[PDB]
Amino acid sequence: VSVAPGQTARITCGEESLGSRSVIWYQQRPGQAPSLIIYNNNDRPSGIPDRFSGSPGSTFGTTATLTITSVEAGDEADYYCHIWDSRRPTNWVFGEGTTLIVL
Amino acid sequence: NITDDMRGELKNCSFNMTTELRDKKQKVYSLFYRLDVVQINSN
Amino acid sequence: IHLENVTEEFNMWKNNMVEQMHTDIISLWDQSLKPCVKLTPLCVTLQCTNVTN
Numbered sequence: 001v002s003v004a005p006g007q008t009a010r011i012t013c014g015e016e017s018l019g020s021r022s023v024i025w026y027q028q029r030p031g032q033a034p035s036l037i038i039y040n041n042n043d044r045p046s047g048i049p050d051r052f053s054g055s056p057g058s059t060f061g062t063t064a065t066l067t068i069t070s071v072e073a074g075d076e077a078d079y080y081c082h083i084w085d086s087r088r089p090t091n092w093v094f095g096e097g098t099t100l101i102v103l
Numbered sequence: 104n105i106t107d108d109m110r111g112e113l114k115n116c117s118f119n120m121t122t123e124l125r126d127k128k129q130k131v132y133s134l135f136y137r138l139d140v141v142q143i144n145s146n
Numbered sequence: 147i148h149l150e151n152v153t154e155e156f157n158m159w160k161n162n163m164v165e166q167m168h169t170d171i172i173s174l175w176d177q178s179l180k181p182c183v184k185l186t187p188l189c190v191t192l193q194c195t196n197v198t199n
């Protein structure tokens with residue numbers, strides 16, 4: 001998955017939505033430990049930058065996205081989604097990785 | 104204990120019938136007089 | 147129309163016409179059903195499970 005620098009990329013991960021959901025986005029640089037990005041659907045902890053667009057949780061029958069704007073070479077990180085639905089049981093494993101290949 | 108020359112006034116019959124559902128069918132029996140059944144045409 | 151002096155007694159408990167109202171609503175309910183479909187072939191063996199939740 002590749003776009004030009006300074007741009008926005010679109011990253012999706014996992015099943016279609018069923019009910020009200022809470023999503024969690026984690027990132028991981030290669031060789032290093034994992035790391036948080038987005039803890040609620042559109043909320044991020046302090047000390048973390050903006051320009052990370054998440055999806056609202058109210059929309060039914062959609063797919064969770066993740067939009068990265070003003071990208072750079074440091075943003076080359078393996079990504080991991082973690083969904084929590086109010087209809088499906090608890091996922092004890094993480095979603096599929098979507099590696100970014102920056103320009 | 105029927106004498107052979109006299110005939111039965113009662114016949115005893117069994118057959119199939121639908122139950123309350125549509126899939127099950129059951130086997131049931133009853134009595135009838137001779138003036139209500141006729142012969143369709145071994146067995 | 148309004149009236150003066152004349153005074154009558156009432157009784158809600160042995161009052162009539164409520165009985166024919168309770169008859170008439172039942173009869174209207176029954177008349178509103180015979181042009182609609184029967185559900186005879188629906189009584190059948192059902193294979194059931196829990197919904198996804």
Ligand SMILES: *[C@@H]1O[C@H](CO)[C@@H](O[C@@H]2O[C@H](CO)[C@@H](O[C@@H]3O[C@H](CO)[C@@H](O)[C@H](O)[C@@H]3O)[C@H](O)[C@H]2NC(C)=O)[C@H](O)[C@H]1NC(C)=O
Pocket residue numbers: 084085086088089090
């Ligand atoms: C989906 O269904 C599961 C049922 O397995 C839900 O898991 C339940 O999660 C709650 C979270 O509060 C657990 O409650 C905790 O229980 C301990 C027991 O002492 C209590 O001390 C804690 O304060 C807390 O209340 C609950 O145990 C757990 N169920 C089982 C069987 O372990 C889950 O929340 C449901 N929803 C989702 C979105 O997954």
Ligand SMILES: *[C@@H]1O[C@H](CO)[C@@H](O[C@@H]2O[C@H](CO)[C@@H](O[C@@H]3O[C@H](CO)[C@@H](O)[C@H](O)[C@@H]3O)[C@H](O)[C@H]2NC(C)=O)[C@H](O)[C@H]1NC(C)=O
Pocket residue numbers: 115116117132
């Ligand atoms: C004609 O009518 C006779 C009686 O007038 C019916 O015969 C009866 O059919 C039942 C079928 O369940 C028999 O019951 C069985 O009896 C044995 C005897 O020990 C028992 O071990 C079984 O567990 C069961 O209870 C009953 O015996 C039988 N009557 C006689 C006198 O044998 C019959 O259904 C009718 N239809 C025909 C013959 O097509």
Ligand SMILES: *[C@@H]1O[C@H](CO)[C@@H](O[C@@H]2O[C@H](CO)[C@@H](O[C@@H]3O[C@H](CO)[C@@H](O)[C@H](O)[C@@H]3O)[C@H](O)[C@H]2NC(C)=O)[C@H](O)[C@H]1NC(C)=O
Pocket residue numbers: 117118119130
């Ligand atoms: C009432 O329903 C029962 C059950 O559905 C009927 O029994 C079925 O009767 C037919 C003809 O009598 C049987 O066909 C025969 O099969 C045997 C071996 O399978 C074969 O040797 C014969 O040549 C003939 O093809 C059938 O198998 C039998 N089914 C069962 C489950 O017993 C019965 O005929 C119905 N009517 C009455 C009046 O009892």
Ligand SMILES: *[C@@H]1O[C@H](CO)[C@@H](O[C@@H]2O[C@H](CO)[C@@H](O)[C@H](O)[C@H]2NC(C)=O)[C@H](O)[C@H]1NC(C)=O
Pocket residue numbers: 106107108109110111
């Ligand atoms: C039921 O009753 C009839 C009537 O009696 C029996 O029919 C007889 O059958 C035998 C042999 O087929 C004849 O010799 C008799 O003349 C018949 N009787 C009449 C009045 O015609 C029949 O056999 C009986 N069945 C059973 C099982 O008892």
